[PDB]
Amino acid sequence: LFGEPAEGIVISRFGMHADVESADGEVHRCNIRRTIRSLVTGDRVVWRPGKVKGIVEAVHERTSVLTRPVKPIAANIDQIVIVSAILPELSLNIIDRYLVGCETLQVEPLIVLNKIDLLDDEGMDFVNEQMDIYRNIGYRVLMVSSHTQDGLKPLEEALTGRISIFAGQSGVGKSSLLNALLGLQNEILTNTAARLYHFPHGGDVIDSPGVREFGLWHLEPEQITQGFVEFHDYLGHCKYRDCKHDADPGCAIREAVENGAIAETRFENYHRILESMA
Ligand SMILES: Nc1nc2c(ncn2[C@@H]2O[C@H](COP(=O)(O)OP(=O)(O)O)[C@H](O)[C@H]2O)c(=O)[nH]1
Numbered sequence: 001l002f003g004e005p006a007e008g009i010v011i012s013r014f015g016m017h018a019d020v021e022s023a024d025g026e027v028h029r030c031n032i033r034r035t036i037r038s039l040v041t042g043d044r045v046v047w048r049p050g051k052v053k054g055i056v057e058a059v060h061e062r063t064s065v066l067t068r069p070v071k072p073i074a075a076n077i078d079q080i081v082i083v084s085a086i087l088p089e090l091s092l093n094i095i096d097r098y099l100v101g102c103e104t105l106q107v108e109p110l111i112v113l114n115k116i117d118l119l120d121d122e123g124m125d126f127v128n129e130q131m132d133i134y135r136n137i138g139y140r141v142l143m144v145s146s147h148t149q150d151g152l153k154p155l156e157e158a159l160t161g162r163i164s165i166f167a168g169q170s171g172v173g174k175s176s177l178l179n180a181l182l183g184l185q186n187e188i189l190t191n192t193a194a195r196l197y198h199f200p201h202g203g204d205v206i207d208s209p210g211v212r213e214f215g216l217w218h219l220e221p222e223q224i225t226q227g228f229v230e231f232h233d234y235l236g237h238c239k240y241r242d243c244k245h246d247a248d249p250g251c252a253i254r255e256a257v258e259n260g261a262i263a264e265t266r267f268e269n270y271h272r273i274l275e276s277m278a
């Protein structure tokens with residue numbers, strides 16, 4: 001016999017159980033109704049307290065769902081923070097692949113360039129010019145340094161009121177940034193393991209090895225194309241209705257690249273991504 005229903009969010013999925021944070025902040029380890037087809041960290045739930053192990057009664061519809069190449073690992077992500085760094089490698093192709101992933105999942109991306117402390121004036125100007133590629137197509141870019149904490153404040157402001165994950169290649173400083181931001185004292189990131197944490201100034205983050213390894217699954221060409229937001233306005237304006245936007249005569253996208261309206265690396269990476277699929 002249980003009590004009154006209440007809202008909650010899944011902090012972590014214990015395989016057979018789940019730790020649900022109630023709308024009042026208290027965490028309760030709960031069982032899961034057999035009728036629940038799937039429950040993952042980030043799910044918004046209707047639960048009831050036991051009269052101390054409560055029970056999950058239902059799961060609200062997910063605004064988004066993160067999956068592994070097609071099983072859900074996390075739910076209700078609002079923003080994926082794409083983290084890069086000068087070292088070990090600043091890859092525009094990696095960033096572009098992630099952005100395609102964001103557009104496909106329909107979650108807003110946040111491009112973070114970490115380790116700016118490793119650059120001098122000339123280094124800074126170069127990196128900023130690179131990031132302008134992204135600023136110019138509407139994405140917000142943040143220059144930061146975990147070690148110096150520079151730019152960390154605007155990052156917190158961009159994290160508040162949202163549920164994020166930190167995606168990026170190894171060594172860019174994900175664990176470093178998260179530790180600096182979370183200020184954990186009695187927990188440690190795993191440096192079904194996905195767990196959500198609360199940032200001091202608002203907003204949450206779901207983390208674990210798999211989440212950070214957020215990869216791009218098999219996508220159809222059209223999905224890749226939609227994955228480049230600056231392409232949208234040119235679609236339907238190519239000479240051929242079925243223009244593949246490669247060497248096709250009169251391609252509006254390619255010409256835009258040749259005029260400077262679209263960045264060359266974006267077009268180039270668009271094709272590289274297209275190729276690595278099928
Ligand atoms: N110079 C510099 N080094 C950084 C910065 N942040 C992280 N590092 C170094 O980058 C390496 C990888 O950090 P890590 O958090 O493990 O990257 P991760 O694999 O994405 O979690 C070293 O462990 C960190 O000391 C930074 O802001 N500036």
Ligand SMILES: [Mg+2]
Pocket residue numbers: 200201
């Ligand atoms: Mg603070």
Ligand SMILES: [Zn+2]
Pocket residue numbers: 238243244245246248250251252253254
């Ligand atoms: Zn075209």
